[PDB]
């Protein structure tokens, strides 16, 4: 079935808990010190199911009072839609006003409003106040239909059961394919079970069995087993509010605000790039409202529209994420569009610059914030919750053993490689791999293709060298290499303690003026030849010993040898005895 979450908004006493009791069945508040004052105290659940649309409407009604809109802001949050309730005798009340704002600031769209106590009102007043709503709602562009009931009588309860299916009908959901993200209500421990916490599915679907993050404290745990309203699942999904078994969870290290995450889906942070029409005084510091969790932050002004937000706790969220801000003594301010969690940048400058790609190219925005590093999909989707757009990338970038590199860093770089690398080259023989990381990071994903495309670097060793094939014999080292390789075949050990570098030494076994012989013998090639027909000289009759009289050499030496010329073709080991091949 479908799975869809609405919240009750309100002014205080005007009907809202009473309502929901009467169109759910279920008591929101169930918590005595309820019924005794009749007033519902903090966030409170229920559901309502459609059968014949076949979705679950879970609901969370909220608290009236001011003293409890942090509650609930929390409430709110996650809700696709918002059951706005009004009390005609009261008319349009500020907490009316706040709530329906702070859905709005929280990006909802859809609802019902609610003319409550139609028992206790005569149809004039009723009308009047139905008209008073109206003009409200398209105030503040969030119409909805109206249904006049009585919680009490019962009247027309059913012609709202109706509007809101026939709303739901009209929503879609497309949450259920994001990553898993569950917003934690509380958490508690259940006797032969363990740690369960309970929240509202916000994006993804969990099933049993499947591995997720309590993110905050940051422990992994295989969901044991989990149910929705006294019921067992073992599927649960954005819209649905789900209780999770995660035992590796102490319960009382979690409250609300905690997330449920598939692992690595995800990204800390405390800079944000946002978007709000509330102009913020770098001053004073302002909360900042949402996956029912308060934060407090400081802001700094990047152009208008357009604000930096430093937090005071790292935070999980997403690109797109509505926020909702309040002044330091806890009025409505406004909400905030998340344009970029995790910048690297807090400098104005670069911001500015790129707003035209932040906001209608975020891969472009991406591809500057590091250009280097490129871009790996499966990052995007980490901070967006959706995988890129193949064109954003296209005509723009050309990538290369997986990550997205936008063709322009390339040739940015290709003149800082080999500016560096010819005037380095100038007076050594070469520059260190390492060396280029001073600078340039690792490149090693790339650095093949810059070099791949420069033809004339090659890398040996722990070197870089430009192609300079008649330095090798104006070499130094290379001379007495090959000086020291007149005394015989020599051990690499050494030849490499005499201190000549291995880039010579291998350089030269490339370029064929020494050979490897045993795994660690070494030979120049003009003793090579010398030995090779010092060998003919026996004819092609050619057995071991009769090489050891030959060559003088023991067969420490000799054998390695031998079997070089086997390599080479030069000699077939056929027994006892070798032959020079045809
Ligand atoms: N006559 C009449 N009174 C109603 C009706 N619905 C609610 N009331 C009265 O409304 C008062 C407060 O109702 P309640 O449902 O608590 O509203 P609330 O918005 O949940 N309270 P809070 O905002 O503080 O959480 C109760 O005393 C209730 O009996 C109705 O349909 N008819
Ligand atoms: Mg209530």
Not at 323 to 346: C, I, M, Q, W, Y
Request: with cysteine; hydrophobic share 40%.
């Amino acid at each position: 079935m479908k799975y869809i979450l609405f919240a009750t908004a309100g002014h205080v006493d005007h009907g809202k808990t009473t309502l929901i009791k009467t169109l759910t069945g279920i008591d929101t508040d169930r918590l005595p010190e309820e019924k005794k004052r009749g007033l519902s105290i903090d966030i409170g659940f229920a559901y309502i199911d459609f059968p014949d649309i076949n979705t679950r409407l879970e609901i969370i009604d909220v608290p009236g009072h001011e003293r409890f809109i942090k509650n609930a802001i929390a409430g709110i949050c996650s809700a696709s839609g918002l059951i706005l309730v009004v009390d005609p005798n009261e008319g349009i009340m500020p907490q009316t006003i706040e709530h329906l704002r702070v859905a709005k600031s929280f990006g909802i769209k859809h609802g019902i409003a609610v003319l409550t106590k139609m028992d206790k009102v005569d149809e004039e007043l009723a009308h009047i106040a139905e008209e008073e709503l109206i003009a409200f709602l398209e105030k503040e562009e969030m119409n909805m239909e109206i249904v006049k009931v009585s919680a009490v009588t019962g009247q027309g309860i059913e012609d709202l059961k109706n509007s809101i299916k026939k709303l739901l009908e009209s929503i879609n959901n497309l949450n259920k394919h994001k990553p898993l993200r569950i917003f934690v209500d509380s958490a508690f421990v259940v006797k032969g079970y363990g740690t369960v916490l309970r929240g509202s599915c916000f994006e993804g679907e969990v099933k049993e069995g499947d591995k997720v993050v309590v993110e905050p404290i940051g422990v992994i745990s295989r969901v044991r087993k989990m149910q929705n309203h006294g019921v067992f699942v073992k599927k649960a999904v954005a819209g649905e509010r789900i209780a999770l078994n995660l035992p590796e969870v102490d319960a009382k290290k979690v409250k609300r605000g905690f997330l449920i995450l598939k692992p690595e889906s995800y990204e800390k942070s405390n800079v944000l790039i946002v978007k709000t029409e509330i102009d913020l005084k770098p001053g004073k510091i302002y909360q900042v409202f949402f996956g029912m969790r308060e934060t407090v932050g400081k802001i700094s002004v990047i152009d208008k529209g357009i604000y930096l937000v430093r937090l005071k706790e790292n935070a999980i969220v997403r690109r797109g994420d509505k926020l909702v801000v309040l002044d330091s003594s806890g009025n409505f301010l406004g909400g905030a569009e998340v344009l970029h969690p995790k910048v690297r940048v807090t400098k104005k400058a670069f911001i500015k610059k790129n707003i035209k790609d932040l906001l209608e190219n975020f891969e472009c925005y991406l591809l500057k914030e590091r250009g280097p590093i490129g871009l790996k999909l499966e990052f995007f989707k980490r901070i967006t919750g959706v995988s890129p757009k193949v064109a954003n990338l296209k005509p723009e970038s050309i990538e290369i053993r997986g990550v997205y590199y936008l063709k322009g860093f390339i040739e940015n770089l290709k003149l800082k490689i080999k500016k560096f690398l010819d005037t380095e080259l100038q007076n050594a023989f070469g520059v260190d791999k390492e060396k280029v990381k001073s600078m340039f990071s690792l490149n090693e994903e790339l650095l093949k293709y810059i070099l791949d495309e420069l033809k004339t670097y090659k890398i040996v060793n722990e070197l870089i060298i430009d192609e300079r094939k008649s330095d090798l014999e104006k070499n130094e080292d290379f001379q007495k290499l090959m000086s020291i390789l007149k005394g015989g075949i020599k051990e690499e050990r050494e030849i490499i303690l005499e201190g000549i570098p291995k880039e010579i030494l291998t350089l030269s076994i490339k370029r064929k003026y020494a050979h490897r012989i045993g795994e660690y013998l070494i030979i120049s090639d003009e003793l090579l030849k010398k030995y090779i027909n010092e060998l003919k000289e026996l004819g092609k009759t050619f057995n071991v010993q009769q090489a050891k009289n030959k060559l003088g050499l023991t067969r420490k030496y000799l054998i390695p040898l031998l079997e070089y010329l086997d390599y080479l073709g030069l000699t077939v080991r056929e027994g006892n005895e070798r032959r020079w091949k045809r």
